[PDB]
Write a protein that binds this ligand. Structure first.
Ligand code: CL
Ligand code: FE2
Ligand code: FE
Ligand code: O
Length: 219
């Protein structure tokens, strides 16, 4: 019964589901508690076809399952696969968005505000990630995870705020869809933005749906 389960559990149960939920604009990352049924019903989307589509990906081979992995290993993976990657992705995107906004300032399709939104996301992610790396992650490794409600609730409120920046970024770029007159820089930047969104959603999902609850439970 896929419809009755939370989006978070589904995204970590079946591979490429993250991308499927991304296709339907379903927030499995910060909204991972919500059931597929409730999320589908709010979008006016056909639940039965989504259940089927999941089975097609479900039967496909298993990747790494992080739900039962050691927390220290989840932490190390997050730092390297996600935090360090965001630290190099964002400065590049900011440079490209600066160029696209300038060069194409005359065009009605130019993503006005994109540079400013990427800049805000970079500044906020950087202080957020530093706190995780300096305090929350070490505290979990040193066995104080059951004591981490304070930082965790703050980290979760900041994940929601990052979620809102992503929505504004998606809206400014026509859901990251380049117009017909887009150039190579403009197209490659939109590919970078989609890659940043995919990574950031999987990053937030791993924190909200696995690391944080299991830490608090004393694992
Ligand atoms: Cl606590
Ligand atoms: Fe993080
Ligand atoms: Fe985080
Ligand atoms: O994060």
């Amino acid at each position: 019964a896929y419809r009755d389960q939370p989006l978070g559990e589904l995204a970590l149960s079946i591979p490429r589901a993250s991308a499927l939920f991304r296709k339907y604009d379903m927030d499995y990352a910060a909204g991972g508690k919500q059931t597929l049924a409730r999320a589908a019903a709010r979008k006016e989307l056909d639940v039965e076809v989504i259940e089927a589509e999941l089975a097609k990906l479900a039967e496909q081979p298993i990747e790494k399952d992080w739900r039962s992995a050691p927390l220290a290993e989840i932490i190390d993976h997050i730092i390297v696969r996600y935090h360090d990657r965001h630290r190099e992705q964002l400065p590049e995107l900011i440079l490209q968005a600066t160029k696209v906004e300038r060069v194409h300032a005359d065009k009605p399709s130019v993503p006005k505000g994109l540079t400013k939104y990427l800049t805000m996301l970079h500044e906020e992610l950087s202080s957020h990630m530093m706190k995780e790396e300096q305090i929350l992650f070490p505290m979990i490794k040193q066995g104080m995870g059951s004591q981490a409600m304070g930082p965790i609730s703050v980290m979760e409120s900041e994940h929601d705020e990052a979620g809102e920046l992503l929505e504004v970024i998606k809206h400014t770029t026509n859901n990251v869809t380049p117009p017909p007159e887009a150039c190579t820089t403009w197209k490659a930047m939109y590919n970078g933005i989609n890659e940043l969104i995919d990574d950031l959603m999987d990053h937030i999902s791993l924190e909200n749906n696995v690391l944080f609850p299991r830490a608090l439970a004393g694992e």
